[PDB]
Amino acid sequence: IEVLDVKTGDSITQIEAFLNPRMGVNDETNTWYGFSEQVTVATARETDRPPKEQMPYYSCARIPLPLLNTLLMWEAVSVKTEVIGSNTLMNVHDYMTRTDNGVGHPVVGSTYHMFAVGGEPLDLQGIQQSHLVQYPEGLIVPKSVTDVTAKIQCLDPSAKAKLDKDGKYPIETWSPDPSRNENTRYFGNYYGGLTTPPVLTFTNTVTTILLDENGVGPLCKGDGLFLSCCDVMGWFTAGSGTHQRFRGLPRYFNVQLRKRAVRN
Amino acid sequence: IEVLDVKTGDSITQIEAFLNPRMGVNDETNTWYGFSEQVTVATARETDRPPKEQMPYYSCARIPLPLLNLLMWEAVSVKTEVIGSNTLMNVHDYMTRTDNGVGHPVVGSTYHMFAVGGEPLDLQGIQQSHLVQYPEGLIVPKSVTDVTAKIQCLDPSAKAKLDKDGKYPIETWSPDPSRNENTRYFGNYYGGLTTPPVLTFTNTVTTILLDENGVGPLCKGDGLFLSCCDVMGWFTAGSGTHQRFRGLPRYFNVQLRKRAVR
Amino acid sequence: EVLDVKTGDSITQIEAFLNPRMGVNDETNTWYGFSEQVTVATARETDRPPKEQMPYYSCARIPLPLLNTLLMWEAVSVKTEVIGSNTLMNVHDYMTRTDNGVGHPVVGSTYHMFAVGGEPLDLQGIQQSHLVQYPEGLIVPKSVTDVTAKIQCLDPSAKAKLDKDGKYPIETWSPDPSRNENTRYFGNYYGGLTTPPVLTFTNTVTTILLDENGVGPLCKGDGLFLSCCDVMGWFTAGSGTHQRFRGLPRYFNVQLRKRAVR
Amino acid sequence: IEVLDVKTGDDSITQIEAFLNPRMGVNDETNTWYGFSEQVTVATARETDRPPKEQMPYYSCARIPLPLLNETLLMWEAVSVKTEVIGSNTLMNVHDYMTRTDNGVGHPVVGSTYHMFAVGGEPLDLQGIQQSHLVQYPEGLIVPKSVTDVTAKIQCLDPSAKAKLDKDGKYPIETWSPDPSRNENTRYFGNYYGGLTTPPVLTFTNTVTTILLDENGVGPLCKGDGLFLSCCDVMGWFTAGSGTHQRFRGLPRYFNVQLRKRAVR
Amino acid sequence: GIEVLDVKTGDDSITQIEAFLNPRMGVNDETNTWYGFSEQVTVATARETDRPPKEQMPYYSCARIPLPLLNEDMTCNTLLMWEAVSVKTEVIGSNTLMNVHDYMTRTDNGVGHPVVGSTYHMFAVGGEPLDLQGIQQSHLVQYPEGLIVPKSVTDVTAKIQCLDPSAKAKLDKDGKYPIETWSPDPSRNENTRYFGNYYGGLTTPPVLTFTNTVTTILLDENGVGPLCKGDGLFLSCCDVMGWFTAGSGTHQRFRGLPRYFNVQLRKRAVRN
């Protein structure tokens, strides 16, 4: 594709969306929405059979764009994105673990943040901590696309997929593919540990540039804008025991798009 | 509004203000002002009934501005400071102690945010638990919409404006990134039970309030809207293991300029 | 009313070390550079700390060279260094020990601040507890105003100037961001009971003191006002579990230039 | 070489992509513990320290042959690289057969981390250095003993302990450092964070370019039309629920190197 | 003071000087089986009986590198000095701390406990020895014979626990100036650039970055680097990574790592 000049003047639009987290309890009518079910630990490598509701997933949405049609395409220039609800973790009166008469123990542990903006679905590369996990039916996992062997514990280049279903691609089996995603920008960070404190910043003043080194943003070839994210804040522990749940937060996107002339 | 040129020459004014923390003991005559009451923890998810004095709140105020009329005061920049980190170096108070060591200082989860705008801060409701029973006299998501499990994620019906000091609990309200066109907000959160608090302080740092088009917040009705919350963690008195939130005050020095608008 | 800088003669460097005032403020005392052992109150109403158990601000007024529309010395920039982090690598002293391991080094809360100005640092009073009974011979909020629960937040009547070395406790006084027009201050705080101390040192970093208009602090009466505090945490001697504040000295090298004024 | 001007236009730029798999000790892709070490055993004495090859992490390396460009000569010059450590998301699996506290989650991978990558026009130069001069390294590895007499000097800088990274999965990280006194024609980057239970930290993106040009605007020159990639990415230790024995866990690294044709004398 | 004139240009106006400085952690003898470590640290039974053996404390490393001779004709109204423009410096051997199979402390069947605790990194490049300011945690320590400590240069009193401006020395001997008694002096070192960082704690994880792509500029605010007096380049460092604990007990040893320097120098004219 030949990328020609930007249009000027009617030539800009803003697309906003909130994506809700898909932490395992993905049903908005369930009392534990925004969390996983209680995590259970395998008795052996060969008996590792996690239920769908115990794992966190990627969130994704395709936003329809105004129709345009040289050819014109919407070009994503920049995004303001925000993870909403760190303030909710300041609740330490809920039914939580307690030391003596101290406050309820807040959400802590491993965190995983990523967002992406693109003109087509996010490209995913499969990879697993254990090749022996028996994933439940009704997900997309590396077994969905290739023969799973010990190679999946490193880089098996046959384990390719696209993020095309909200709440069904587990984060534990799928990474953004750095060998593809020519038409997507993705950003993420991971911080491990069992009891690590979570960290978040929030503002409406920070713009993420989506232009590549040539000044070109993602091009929305199909009249669709693709938003993807995951925002795991750590584990919650209810006062009913020592079982833990993943806790995730929603993410806002406000994407600025401009009309770009193109030729095949 | 079509924004026109800035004025030059009496064209600039500074607004100086502070907001005291609203940590639950919000009465300046109470011996525990600047703290919450002792935090109690629910016996069940269905019996979670926190008293108003045990939770921290947003602070807010509207500063009246010189009447201009059109002209609007435009907020260009702010110097803001959280005052009092020095006070946490008191380890001789009636505090928990290991053997004959110092008093255990304030530690735990921190929540810092400030906002400067030309109208009240837009809030989005969100909660850790949809089953919490909030006390009478507060503004919570239940004040504006039916509260269901959707409130644990993003329920777009849970919209409010920060329009009362010490009444909007931080645990139920986020700054709304989908609104606040006429406000700049900034914040950071760090969790954990015993995490060390961190603060910087200086009079040399200016926060720019101009947007990408070089336009600051425009003060509707000649009012400047300031908002904040500065939770430093929990204090533990030597009388037991019960903990209290501890907050600190925030200073604002806002530079405003006159901006013509259509 | 600030006019043009002079050129050519027209620059001077002023150097000083300020020794820490950690409570043992007497350079002939064997515990100089430390506090006395910290005792913890038995009750909120019986909190009576001896002067030697609390850290203080350090300060000095450095007389300046002759230079006389008048001229004033304008502070352009400073190189400042906390000296002695290397001393904390001593783990063979009479210290707490785990089995046959090293002596437990200084850890805990840190408070660093420095200021350079043309008049004394303006201080705002604020306290963790309004009920502390401060000893005689200090300057505390009680020295300037009625102490009430308001002092746990911002009581704007609690104003003072840092005009005595080793007498203004850090636990009752913050640099005042509503004043200090003619001073630049910088500080950071990191809490916790056993947090590791962190320090950088170099002779290659210059702190600029010029404001947004290119004007540095102007030295009234030809005096340069330096202020600091550098608490590194607590030391624990092998004689028990009682702890002492440990502080380090700070070096300043301020570049001044001659400035014409009305 | 006298370095002359860059070439311009159609065909003057090429991109080389590769994934390098980690060599954590279990280096066989058919083994059920691929991407991990074998269970780490600790010496009973300084003089009985005999680690099996499968219990130690290694440098990964590959030489990628480049397009034909000659018939002044031209060399491919590495300008920049996008590199990514893949798979931090896999550490969010806390349901596997792992240690747990009461009914809490499986204890995830934690501990010491070692990240390094290098891009060059010849093999990475290595400097030998060891925690203990008394370790008895197993047959089939390349260690300082391979190139010099090992003495207590190896616990500091013994300048006789020089080697080139010329074999994947055979140079243990615990005996070899990138040599800052050589590597004129390679750029290397790394970070280390120690501790027994330290949380691992990783960022990932496709928007960050690492510039490989030196102070004179010259990148690594592929003197033999080969691009040399090297790395190690230790994430910490994994603990299986079968015991308290630990395994190193590593992750693969992606490289996408931009090269341009450079005239040389 | 040296009156600085123009930089020279062209062939042979530039040279690069490289060196490795080995750490001096207490076991300073390269033939000793614990080279690069301290002897096992012992803790005083009282403030008045604090008598540390010289092998139990880390020291500053230093070297003077000879430079090409510049000034054979001392009648000239202008002379030349080597000016240090920049340095690439690297602490080598963080990878060695990934050895957790050595004879080390262990929890159950877990890995050997690696080096952790307080870190102290510093390096300096100058045209004369690094200026040192004495300062101590305790004025009562009895230092062993054959070291240079504040007592070597002044009367040691409680003042030494803060800033005693009489405690001045120059870093002129490798492995003899303990880090616990000497700081780089910010009131001198006009002709040296120094850089350091300290992180405390008993079990803090050590942190290190390494690369060959980072240049440290040595030019001052006037564009002038250190000027090499007597055609000597002075390098100084210390790189304590924490404490090692052998499986023979709970006694701990300091562990240090070597540092590389590659200094770019240029000829600078000065008034004679």
CB B221 within 8 A of CB B227: no
Domain locations in chain E as residue ranges: 4-130+190-271
Pick the CATH number of E4-130+190-271 from 1.20.1050.10, 2.60.175.10, 3.40.50.2300, 1.20.1600.10: 2.60.175.10
Determine the Cα–Cα distance for residues E39 and D188; give it in Å rounded to an integer. Answer: 34
What does the block give as tokens for A157? 């280049």
Comparing C-alpha atoms, which of E100, E198, E254, E116 is closest to residue D195?
E116
Task: Decide if D96 and A151 are in contact by the 8 Å CB cutoff.
Answer: no
Distances (CA, A) of E204 to C89, C206, D197, E241: 13, 30, 11, 10
Residue E61 burial by CB count (10 A; 0-12/13-18/19+): exposed, middle or buried? Answer: buried
Q: Which of C100, C235, C249 sits opposite E251 (nearest CB)?
A: C100
Gap between the Cα atoms of C72 and C118, Å rounded: 10
CA distance B20 to B26: 9
Q: Cβ of C204 under 8 Å from any chain E Cβ?
A: yes
**Looking at the DSSP assignment, which residues form a beta bridge with residue C172?**
none
Nearest-neighbour CA in chain E from C90: distance (Å): 6
> What SS3 state is found at C68?
coil
| Residue whose entry in the numeric block shows the structure tokens 């303006």 | C122
CA atoms within a 13 Å half-sphere pointing along the CA-CB vector of E225: 26
d(CA A178, CA D108): 25
Q: How many residues in total does chain C contain? A: 262
Q: How far from E218 is each of C257, D216, E121, E227, E229, CA to CA, in Å? A: 25, 18, 18, 11, 16
Six token digits for residue D236: 């910490």
Name the residue type at position A135.
Answer: Y
Phi-psi region of A211 (alpha: psi -120 to 50; beta: other; left: phi over 0): beta
Q: A88 and B132 in contact by Cβ < 8 A?
A: no
Helices (H), chain D: none
Residue E237 contacts residue E21 (beta carbons within 8 Å): yes
CA angle, corner A58, sides to A189 and A117, nearest 5?
Answer: 70
Q: How many CB atoms sit inside 10 A of residue E4's CB?
A: 17
User: For residue B154, is it left (φ>0), alpha (ψ between -120 and 50) or beta?
Assistant: beta
How many residues belong to chain E? 272
CB burial of A154-163 (b: ≥16 within 10 Å; e: otherwise) equals bbbeebbbbb
Please count the other Cβ atoms lying within 10 Å of the Cβ belonging to residue A259: 18
Residues D115, D118, D121: CA angle, nearest 5 degrees:
170
Q: Is C195 near chain B, with CB under 8 Å?
A: yes
Closest CA to C177 of D31, B18, A216: B18
Torsion angle of C-alpha atoms C158, C161, C165, C171, degrees rounded to 10: 30
CA distances (Å), E68 to each of A153, D77, D86, in order?
Answer: 56, 34, 50
Distance to chain D for A129, nearest Cα, Å? 5
Q: Please report, to the nearest 10 degrees, the dihedral formed by the alpha carbons of residues E189, E191, E193, E198 taken in order.
A: -10
Q: Find the CB nearest C104 among E42, E137, E202.
A: E202
Measured distance CA(A29)–CA(A94) in Å, rounded: 20
Q: CA–CA separation, D209 vs D257, rounded Å?
A: 10
d(CA A195, CA D197): 11
CA distance A107 to B195: 13
- Cα separation, D31 vs C103, in Å, equals 46
- Judge: B242–A87 Cβ closer than 8 Å, yes or no: no
Residue C109 C-beta-side C-alpha neighbours within 13 Å: 29
DSSP string, chain A: -EEEEEP----EEEEEEEEPP-SS---TTSTTTTBPPPP---SSGGG----GGGS-B-EEEEEE------EEEEEEEEEEEEE--GGGGG--SSSB-BSTTSPBPPPBS-EEEEEEEESSPPEEEE--S-TT--PPSSS--GGGTS---GGGGS--TT-EEE--STTTSBGGGEEE-TTS-TTEEEEEEEE--SSPPPEEEEESS--EE---TTS---B-TTSEEEEEEEEEEEEEEBTT-S-EEEEE--EEEEEEEEEEEEE-
Any bridge partners for residue D176, and if so which?
Answer: D128
Nearest CA to E23 among D178, D135, D151, D153? D153
What gap in Å lies between CA B160 and CA B142, rounded to an integer?
Answer: 11
Backbone φ, ψ for residue C51 (5° rounding):
-55, -30
Q: How far apart are CA A208 and CA A11, in angstroms?
A: 20
Please, which residues have CB within 8 angstroms of residue B222's CB and are 6 or more apart in sequence? B64, B65, B66, B67, B68, B73
Contacts of E215 (CB under 8 A, 6+ apart): D215, E86, E87, E88
In angstroms, the CA E76 to CA E198 distance is 46
**8 Å CB contact between A65 and A15:** yes
DSSP state of B205: -
- Class of CATH domain C2-43+50-121+160-261: mainly beta
Residue A223 region by backbone torsions, left for phi larger than 0, else alpha for psi between -120 and 50, else beta: left
For residue A234, give both structure tokens: 């750590």
Give whole-number Cα distances, A149 to A159, A215, D18, E179, in Å. Answer: 11, 41, 21, 54
CA dist C173 and C46 (Å) reads: 21
The secondary structure of chain B in percent helix, strand, coil, rounded to multiples of 5, reads: 10, 40, 50
Q: Which amino acid is at C131?
A: L
Interface of C with E in 210-249 (CB under 8 A): 233, 235, 237-238, 248-249
Cβ(E29)–Cβ(E150) below 8 Å: no
Distance of CA B136 to the CA centre of its chain: 21
**Three-state SS sequence of chain E:** CCCEEEECCCCCCEEEEEEEECCECCCCCCCCCCCCECCCCCCCCCHHHCCCCHHHCCECEEEEEECCCCCCCCCCCEEEEEEEEEEEEEECCHHHHHCCCCCECECCCCCECCCECCEEEEEEEECCCCEEEECCCCCCCCCCCCCCCHHHCCCCCHHHHCCCCCCEEECCCCCCCEHHHEEECCCCCCCEEEEEEEECCCCCCCEEEEECCCCEECCCCCCCCCECHHHEEEEEEEEEEEEEEECCCCCEEEEECCEEEEEEEEEEEEEC
**What is the Cα–Cα distance from A39 to A35, expressed in whole angstroms?**
11
A47: which residues sit within 8 A by CB, 6+ positions away?
D97
Q: Taking Cα atoms as reference points, which of B86, A136, D145, D21 lies closest to residue C190?
A: B86
DSSP 8-state class, residue B56:
-
Q: Which of D40, D156, D187 sits opposite E101 (nearest CB)?
A: D40
| C-alpha span between A204 and E4 (Å, rounded) | 51
Residues 6+ apart with CB under 8 A from C210: C76, C77, C216
Partner A contacted by D30 (CB < 8 A): yes
Q: Which of C86, C116, C108 is nearest to C15 (CA)?
A: C116
- What whole-number distance in Å separates Cα of residue D118 and Cα of residue D188? 4
CA D257 – CA A148 distance, rounded (Å): 29
Which positions ≥6 away from D229 have C-beta within 8 Å?
D18, D20, D61, D62, D63, D64, D117, D118, D119, D255, D257
The tokens of E262 are what? 């590659």
* CATH class for the domain made up of A2-263: mainly beta
Q: How many CB atoms lie within 10 A of CB A146?
A: 16
Tokens of C215: 């004007």
Query: How far, CA to CA in Å, does C4 sit from each of C118, C211, C212, D139?
Result: 18, 15, 16, 77
Domain B3-125+179-261 has CATH 2.60.175.10: yes
CA distance D251 to D249: 7
Element of type H or E holding C4: strand C2-5
Residues 6+ apart with CB under 8 A from B33: B25, B26, B27, C149, C150, C152, C153
Most A CBs within 10 A among D13, D19, D89, hence the mutation to make, goes to D89
**CB–CB of C242 and B101 under 8 A?**
yes
> What is the architecture of the domain spanning D3-264?
Sandwich (2.60)
Q: What is the dihedral of CA D206, D207, D208, D211, to 10 degrees?
A: 100
Give A28's contacts in chain B (Cβ within 8 Å). 148-150, 153
| C-alpha distances out from residue E132 to A85, B41, D13, E185, E261, Å | 52, 56, 53, 5, 21
Q: Are B30 and C149 in contact (CB under 8 A)?
A: yes
- A18 part of contact set with chain B, CB < 8 Å: yes
Q: What residues in D contact E101, CB-CB < 8 Å? A: 40-43, 49, 51, 55-56, 135
Per the rule left: phi > 0, alpha: psi between -120 and 50, beta: everything else, B151 is alpha
Residue to test with chain E: of C22, C26, C58, C92, most E Cβ within 10 A: C92
H or E segment to which residue D4 belongs: strand D3-6
